[PDB]
Amino acid sequence: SVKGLVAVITGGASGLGLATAERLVGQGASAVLLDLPNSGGEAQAKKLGNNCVFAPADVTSEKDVQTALALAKGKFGRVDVAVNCAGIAVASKTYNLKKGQTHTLEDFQRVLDVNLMGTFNVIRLVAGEMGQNEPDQGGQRGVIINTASVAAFEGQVGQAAYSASKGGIVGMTLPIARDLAPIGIRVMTIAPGLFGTPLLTSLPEKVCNFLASQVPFPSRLGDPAEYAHLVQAIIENPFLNGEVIRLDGAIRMQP
Amino acid sequence: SVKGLVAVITGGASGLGLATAERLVGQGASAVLLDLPNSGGEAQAKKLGNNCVFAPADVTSEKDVQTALALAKGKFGRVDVAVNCAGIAVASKTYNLKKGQTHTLEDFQRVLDVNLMGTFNVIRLVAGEMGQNEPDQGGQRGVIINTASVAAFEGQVGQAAYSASKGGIVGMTLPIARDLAPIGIRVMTIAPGLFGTPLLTSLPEKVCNFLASQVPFPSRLGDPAEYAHLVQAIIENPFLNGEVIRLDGAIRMQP
Amino acid sequence: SVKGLVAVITGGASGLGLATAERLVGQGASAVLLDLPNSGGEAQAKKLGNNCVFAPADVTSEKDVQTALALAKGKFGRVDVAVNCAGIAVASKTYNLKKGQTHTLEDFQRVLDVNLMGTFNVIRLVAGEMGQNEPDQGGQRGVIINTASVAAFEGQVGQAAYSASKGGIVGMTLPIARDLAPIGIRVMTIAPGLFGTPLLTSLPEKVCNFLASQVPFPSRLGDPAEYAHLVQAIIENPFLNGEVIRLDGAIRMQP
Amino acid sequence: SVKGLVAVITGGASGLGLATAERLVGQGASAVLLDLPNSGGEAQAKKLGNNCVFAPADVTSEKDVQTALALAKGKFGRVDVAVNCAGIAVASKTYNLKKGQTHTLEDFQRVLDVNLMGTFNVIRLVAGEMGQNEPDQGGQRGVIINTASVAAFEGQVGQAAYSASKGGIVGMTLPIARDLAPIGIRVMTIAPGLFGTPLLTSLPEKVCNFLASQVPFPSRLGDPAEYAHLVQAIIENPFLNGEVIRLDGAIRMQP
Amino acid sequence: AAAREEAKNIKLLETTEEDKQKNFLFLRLWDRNMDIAMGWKGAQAMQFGQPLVFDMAYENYMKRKELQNTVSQLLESEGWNRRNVDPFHIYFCNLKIDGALHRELVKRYQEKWDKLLLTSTEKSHVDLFPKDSIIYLTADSPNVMTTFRHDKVYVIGSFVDKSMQPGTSLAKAKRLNLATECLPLDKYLQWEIGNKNLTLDQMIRILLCLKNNGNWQEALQFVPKRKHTGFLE
Ligand SMILES: NC(=O)c1ccc[n+]([C@@H]2O[C@H](COP(=O)([O-])OP(=O)(O)OC[C@H]3O[C@@H](n4cnc5c(N)ncnc54)[C@H](O)[C@@H]3O)[C@@H](O)[C@H]2O)c1
Ligand SMILES: NC(=O)c1ccc[n+]([C@@H]2O[C@H](COP(=O)([O-])OP(=O)(O)OC[C@H]3O[C@@H](n4cnc5c(N)ncnc54)[C@H](O)[C@@H]3O)[C@@H](O)[C@H]2O)c1
Ligand SMILES: NC(=O)c1ccc[n+]([C@@H]2O[C@H](COP(=O)([O-])OP(=O)(O)OC[C@H]3O[C@@H](n4cnc5c(N)ncnc54)[C@H](O)[C@@H]3O)[C@@H](O)[C@H]2O)c1
Ligand SMILES: NC(=O)c1ccc[n+]([C@@H]2O[C@H](COP(=O)([O-])OP(=O)(O)OC[C@H]3O[C@@H](n4cnc5c(N)ncnc54)[C@H](O)[C@@H]3O)[C@@H](O)[C@H]2O)c1
Ligand SMILES: Nc1ncnc2c1ncn2[C@@H]1O[C@H](CSCC[C@H](N)C(=O)O)[C@@H](O)[C@H]1O
């Protein structure tokens, strides 16, 4: 069970973060949806009930995340789990010879800031918050679960910046786990494949059908409920640490 | 859930396989401990209850595995899950200039037979029985979980044959997942680290404490119950496929 | 043979970049040491000879890299190879509970900007520069080699930012190779281990000597000449693309 | 340079092994083509010159490899390099539900015996002779370069046994490197992609053409001269050890 | 084109911007990706797929117009095969290199011909597969197909005879002494008015539906509706 746990879910107003919040609150936990002010996260928080609260914050801003964690601590008294699901996607080729078009540096920089820098900002602040928790019978003060992508391993054409940020998350998973091992905080990463979230369901139906056919088995877009299930499995297993799990249905992206 | 599932657990009379069988049978599932005739699996199967039966088989023999699968079908009528936990360990340096001692081809071949050839034997034979299953909601007919090792990635001195077998398992995890995708069988691999099973206690007790300390967090040898928990999580999640999960507590093996 | 090639080597005034420039200019190629103005690159460029020039530039600035590439085109007329060796290191734990010390977002941002963002800036601008080349017999217009670290895989304590940046480089290596394949540009990454450069000799000699002793074979710090040799080998072999090569001497880092 | 070196090349009568032998002997080295008696090795040795000899041996047999190594020592006096390029491919699906066809255990065993068991046999036997070598100025007594495939990491349908053998080679690369580090022997692995050799004769011509077109860049089949060049580069770089190098032109295999 | 130009200027008048926030995971290169996926599947089928033969041995029984029709139906059949989740391994047997049919196929396919993932050969289906595994599909066979068999090689006559020549495919199959089967159309459909010989594309679609565990109703949904009146209950 995860009853009584407090989860800070960044990007918790939509998609994978929303599914994780729904599952965890359904099992009896308390959730803090840390999201952007104009993401409609207050409606989701109210829909989830009393055990869910909304924190309007930008993961790329230290002050916003600090205020969100202060709100979480005041409302629920502590933080046990952190789920970094905030992120943005951008498609852009590094260089197009035919069009003479070059990848803009702003796109790369903002993708980095939102994904990699935002994940690290949340991780460090929430690790500081967890360090105050009395270790349990197993000596654990908390769990941090980051959302990478399979683009961190076989990113496609136009995914240079996205792949850079997700590969950064993958590369920094183990060092942070080693850093926080003395503190008793487990650090894990989930690298989902193609999931039926607003980041993908907004595409034309033919594209969605093709993507579903591209998954070996099951030949469908991943359900966010499956991501939530894997997150809960990581939370409950005390021996999963410093590892990246590919929740992608055995797909390997084509160029 | 796992209520009503039938699991064939190779090497299920001791260690990780026994823990998996205990967890699954304790949750309303049925277990077939496929183990060697002299492994003392009859006592384990009797202790577990009626939902557990013992099949004396050698995973390296086609006839024995076929007989065990026939017994499983006769007793329960189905095979939903397969868990390859049968394996042996050999410690021997490839060469020793100081001693002039060379690895014997027999040791390498025995390790490969039990660990890599037996695993593929069981997989290929149980895909036949899981292929007779009527696909359920989602098109899945079964799940196959394999036990690799972190030695497939970071192998230590005098561990070349074990590393070869586990690396073969890791390498063939994805091709087999691509083979059985049309059938609807998910193929997963677990790469456990250091676990408190009879395999490790054979080492000197002084070394047990050192190995426990060598784990970043938790600083202890893994509990087989955690392996069973990860196995159940893989069974429950319908989107994990063709992936290797390191259940090692962030440990990295040194030379 | 690399005679006649033009290599833009970032961070070419010291360490691995200087070793690469020395090796390549010795063969007969022309080099452009793209480095910070107050770095001593002028002396190195004068020492190397008439085929080496110094470009005072910051890899994190678009204008500076544009000026450096304009200087390279004005001097040598074209660019054939681009070796990204610019980078910085920071040692800082993500969080220290005993000291109550938290990693500063400034350090993480700075390391990301230099190691990761600057690498992509140089990659995109030099890909634009190399698209003007007439393809050779094999249809190749240029080669881009980037420097990563084994921290991308085996990150140590207080290496979260460095590991994040190097993992970002590793993740972006393949997407960029897929992007630039139609142009005819190969993208490769070298993940060195420990080398005897100014980035390491700064650290206390005791810990550096301990790390050097822990390299399986050769039990020493890597020689930058070896890095330059691998760079030349990558340049020569036309079939190496989208791959990371660990030039670490078989060392896997410990926490 | 590589002048005066003695290289034992397994499977050196055809394809990658023959290309490696040609390159090394042309560079001034000595070669022993360790191959099957009916493989046409003697004609290749005659065509290469007086610095190359043919050893009729089966890598799956200890006695044959011992005789080949004795012949190599008699002719040249020492062994410095060992290139394991002997292997076979099998195209068989694990299980075919529609056809009711099951992978034959004999095919899996044969592929494992040749690709994986034979490689380790050669490695362990040749380490004994390379241990008698006087250590170099850097302490190096010799180099062993194994051949793997990208199937070890991404194996397609009907490649379970081949993937298992190549993954076993990949997994055992590092343990053997650690084992032989004390005696100054470097162990490296090359994972080629698609090369034009008699190995691919089995596939239909159109399948080979499509696969070649699916290489990002260069969009063609690998030239064995490139494999030989990479082998020589590994021979000449004293700091490459324990690593796997993907020589595949950035291709990634799909189901 | 003119309507699209004027409407394009009209759509330019909006200038609303803020389109998806530029939060895109993939570039719009979907046709290329679909083609590449179909190519990978075709390679897998060429290696492990079930054989299906079109025997191009009727050039002497067909006029020019019938030859053009046969080529068009062959293209449609091949296209339908490529898209399938489990494609056949298509063989073009008895295809003379310099014959009229091969010439038209090459003209129609251009450079794609050498890249089509199928086996084209001058040899007959009896020189490539055991005579026992070959089932030659004809509308005049005494036997009636009951179930699709996955270990059998089905042979379809690439023949379009708008001038009726009954028994030609049956006669050809009889010279080689091959087993013959006919699609069940009297059993499942009230035939009404029409011709009992379907086109190549319809045949391949029916066979593909059957190979994917489809029933006879779903498989025979590809029979033109104008011919029959309903599926017999
Ligand atoms: N959707 C996929 O198929 C897929 C696949 C692999 C990885 N991912 C990653 O999984 C994560 C889950 O996102 P999703 O798929 O649900 O898409 P999503 O857009 O539905 O979820 C992203 C969430 O992050 C929030 N957010 C964005 N920027 C923020 C910021 N600066 N501060 C705070 N909150 C911010 C958004 O408001 C939203 O709630 C993302 O990081 C995504 O890149 C998604
Ligand atoms: N013990 C660890 O910490 C650890 C770590 C990593 C991997 N592993 C792997 O996990 C698996 C679990 O082993 P364990 O730790 O429980 O040790 P164990 O010895 O308790 O379990 C091994 C089991 O395999 C059975 N077995 C061996 N050969 C067999 C054969 N031919 N036919 C049938 N059964 C056979 C044995 O009887 C025994 O029941 C093994 O494959 C092991 O290599 C273990
Ligand atoms: N030293 C090692 O063993 C090791 C190991 C793994 C990776 N690396 C990476 O190798 C690369 C080479 O470092 P090194 O060992 O030669 O140390 P170094 O300090 O000599 O190399 C860094 C060089 O980059 C230049 N540089 C830094 N920031 C710059 C900027 N913004 N614009 C332009 N030039 C800039 C510096 O002036 C210097 O010349 C670094 O990227 C490092 O992270 C080093
Ligand atoms: N061909 C490719 O594109 C490709 C790709 C990846 C890996 N590989 C590996 O590269 C190696 C070279 O194969 P190749 O492409 O040159 O094909 P090949 O058939 O020309 O090479 C195989 C060689 O091994 C020899 N051989 C086979 N069994 C032997 C045995 N038992 N004892 C001694 N010699 C034996 C054969 O006589 C032959 O000379 C193989 O191990 C193959 O698996 C090849
Ligand atoms: N009802 C049916 N049963 C079996 N095969 C059929 C069929 N209708 C069409 N076909 C197949 O489609 C091909 C094109 S129809 C041409 C029919 C011509 N009378 C002949 O001699 O074959 C036929 O050759 C046969 O292979």
Author numbering:
A (entry chain C), B (entry chain B), C (entry chain D), D (entry chain A): 7 to 261
E (entry chain F): 154 to 386
Cite, word for word, the article reporting this structure.
Metazoan mt-RNase P is a multi-enzyme assembly comprising the endonuclease PRORP and a tRNA methyltransferase (MTase) subcomplex composed of the MTase, TRMT10C, and the dehydrogenase, SDR5C1. We determined the structures of these four mt-tRNA maturation complexes using single-particle cryo-EM at a global resolution ranging from 2.7 to 3.2 Å, revealing snapshots of the four tRNA maturation steps, i.e. N1-methylation of purine 9, 5′-leader and 3′-trailer processing and 3′-CCA addition. The architecture of the maturation complexes is globally the same in all structures, i.e. TRMT10C asymmetrically straddles a tetramer of SDR5C1, while wrapping around the pre-tRNA. Our structures show that the TRMT10C/SDR5C1 complex can be a scaffold that presents mitochondrial pre-tRNAs as substrates for chemical modification, i.e. methylation, and nucleolytic cleavages at defined 5′ and 3′ sites and, finally 3′-CCA addition.
The cryo-EM structure of the TRMT10C/SDR5C1/pre-tRNAHis(0,Ser)/ELAC2 complex reveals ELAC2 bound to pre-tRNAHis, poised to process the pre-tRNAHis 3′-trailer. The scissile phosphodiester bond between tRNAHis and tRNASer(AGY) is actually positioned in the active site of ELAC2. As a member of the metallo-β-lactamase superfamily, ELAC2 has a highly conserved metal-coordinating signature motif 546HxHxDH551, together with H644, D666, H702 and H724, that coordinates two Zn2+ ions to constitute the catalytic site. The density map suggests the presence of only one of the two Zn2+ ions, which is consistent with the H548A mutation. tRNAHis adopts an L-shaped conformation and its four arms interact with TRMT10C, similarly to the complex with mt-RNase P. The acceptor and T-arms of pre-tRNAHis are involved in extensive contacts with ELAC2, mostly with the Nter β-lactD that offers a shape and charge-complementary surface to bind the pre-tRNA. Nucleotides G1 and A2 of tRNASer(AGY) appear unpaired in the density map and are buried together with nucleotide C73 of tRNAHis in the ELAC2 active site formed by the interaction of the two β-lactDs. On the opposite side of pre-tRNAHis, the extension of the ELAC2 Nter β-lactD (residues 249-302), absent in ELAC1, interacts with the T-loop of pre-tRNAHis. Deletion of the Nter β-lactD extension abolishes tRNA binding and thus inhibits cleavage activity, showing that this fragment of ELAC2 is a small RNA-binding domain that recognises the T-loop of mt-tRNAs and drives the tRNA-binding of ELAC2. Our structure of ELAC2/mt-pre-tRNAHis(0,Ser) shows in detail this specific situation in which pre-tRNASer(AGY) is released by 3′-end processing of the bordering TRMT10C-bound mt-pre-tRNAHis, providing a structural interpretation of the results from previous studies on the processing of this pair.
